[PDB]
Amino acid sequence: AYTTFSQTKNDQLKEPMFFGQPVNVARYDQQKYDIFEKLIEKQLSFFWRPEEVDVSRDRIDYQALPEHEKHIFISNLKYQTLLDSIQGRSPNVALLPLISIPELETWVETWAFSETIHSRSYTHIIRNIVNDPSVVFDDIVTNEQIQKRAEGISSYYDELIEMTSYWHLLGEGTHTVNGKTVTVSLRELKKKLYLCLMSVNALEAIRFYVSFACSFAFAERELMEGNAKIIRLIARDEALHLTGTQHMLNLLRSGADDPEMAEIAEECKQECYDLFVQAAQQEKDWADYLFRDGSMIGLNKDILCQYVEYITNIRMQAVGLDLPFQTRSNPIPWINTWL
Amino acid sequence: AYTTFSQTKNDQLKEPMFFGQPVNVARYDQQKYDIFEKLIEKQLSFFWRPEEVDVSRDRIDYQALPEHEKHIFISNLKYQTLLDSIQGRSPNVALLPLISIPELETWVETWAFSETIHSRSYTHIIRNIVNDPSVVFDDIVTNEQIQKRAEGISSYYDELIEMTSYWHLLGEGTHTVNGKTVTVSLRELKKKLYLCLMSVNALEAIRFYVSFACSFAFAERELMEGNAKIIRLIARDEALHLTGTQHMLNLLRSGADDPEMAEIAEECKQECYDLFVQAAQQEKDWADYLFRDGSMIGLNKDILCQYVEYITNIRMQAVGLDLPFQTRSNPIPWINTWL
Ligand SMILES: [Fe+3]
Ligand SMILES: [Fe+3]
Ligand SMILES: [Fe+3]
Ligand SMILES: [Fe+3]
């Protein structure tokens, strides 16, 4: 029942963000929510290409790094490339079929596109610092630690796409699939969406910000400066991306957009809190892997775990969740100059 | 069975364009088909924003147009906005779930994104020349003539998405859906893809080029020059877009990518020819609507129909179809300076 051009002339100003009539005409003279129009415009204004950044000195730095410092740098880079491999495609495959207002439709496609630039920038970095990029790229899919995070993150998107496919084909109700019982509930699909957005918000607002700290710690030592300039550009995009999911999550939560979402968001409250806590703990456990073979000037397991708690508290509050950790000051204030 | 990060470490250089393992890692150090990497790079190099173009004189021109010339201009603009409303979303929703090589995945997301810029540029034009843009935007969905083309074009995408949803959930075979028979065939889904790409190629390579002729005919009269500058930028993107579908269609046809596609493409040959002929006839009938109330200097029903035949022959040949019309010279050679 999904359609790439819905024939009904609907008032797009009254549609909900999600699960309404698929957007027919893409117009930009008006918005229900102008934050999405402001995010499009800002992301457009930021357009950059990786090749605009000189990464030619980073091979020298990378080779001069002690082996455990190479391990810190490349593990971090591998994790970023994993995450924006998912982010390049997943907003488009998972969110587009559900969007019912043009400004959010176009924001999501602009968001995903900006992720492909990030993915291309990671390739630009990798091929300029290692001799065999395939070894790096292949380790991303087979790395025991990396593959752990990939599973959980992608499952939020996959479960949403699968249930979407059932809902578009069958609609709500209980159905027969080769003698199996399939209960299709829009309330449940709305739950899958809200949890997915919560997971995506933790991804961009916490998981990538932990990784930014690792990259900029090298830059603080005047090393891997080409990488650091690219990460500055990525982080500036990332701030737009998390603002997007913050607004989607809060507009759903308030009931201003879908009153059914407000009560779903309350039912999901503990499960949202738990998923944020788990992601923060997973990033703490990732720090044990990053520093498995030793630490470096300005960054170690303890410092980075403090930063996880610091940033997690900020992000959870902004989407209305209680704080899981003691309130603390920024343990790495030097990171602010890069952001 | 669709996954946003497939866990198997596969050789992406050996995957097919479509229906293979979904792309896990987005890497750009290598390509199976470097045309898609070249298209990404070129489209990135072309990045433009509508607001970079001064459209401030076009309101004066538009108001000075006789009523039938306003009708020609705005009907053409309405049709373009319809078509790139579909093109902004549909490559992402319809093609992304099926792509199994990273360079094609990223090309498709870059292609769709560049379409949203076109859609935003049409909004930029509309709001600068009419007093009530809503009347324009609403007529796009309700216009009897426009809605006719929207139905057929969107059906190629919708049928492909629906069958995709059955294939990811159920896989190949015959299944029970509430006591109904559903035969899911990958060969059939491959047929839906190939016909869709043929339809999309006619869309961008013929239907939009007919509309470019209308826009540039005004520019030839030194009218609507702001519009014309935007259409120049759009047409330059369009040439990349049709090159993309040309290569997908030809690589599938050759069997170089999927040997099963080569025999499917032969079985589909007459039906591909017929769909191109129908689109050309539909564009000829659209010219009767554009010039319903009279013609203008340099462009009329007869001239535009000659251009339909001229351009249709070129596009059909490039994707290996026989020519439906007598071979003729460019009836509007002035269009070349704008392209
Ligand atoms: Fe990113
Ligand atoms: Fe992001
Ligand atoms: Fe376009
Ligand atoms: Fe196009």
Residue numbers in the entry:
A (entry chain A), B (entry chain A): 1 to 339
Tell me what the authors wrote about this structure, in their words:
Here, we present a novel polymer-based support and an associated deposition method, with the aim of providing ultralow-background conditions for serial data collection. The supports themselves consist of a thin 2–3 µm thick cyclic olefin co­polymer (COC) membrane perforated with a dense array of 2–3 µm sized holes and suspended on a rigid frame. To assess the quality of structures that can be obtained from chip-mounted crystals, diffraction data were collected from a range of proteins. These proteins included the insulin, thaumatin and HEWL that were used in initial tests, and also TD1, a tubulin–DARPin D1 complex, EcR2a, a class Ia ribo­nucleotide reductase radical-generating subunit, rhodopsin–miniGo and PepTst, a bacterial peptide transporter.
In some cases, such as EcR2a and the membrane-protein complex rhodopsin–miniGo, direct deposition provided satisfactory results. Although a detailed comparison between these two data-collection modes was limited by the different data-processing software, doses per position (ten times higher for the wedges) etc., the final resolutions were similar.
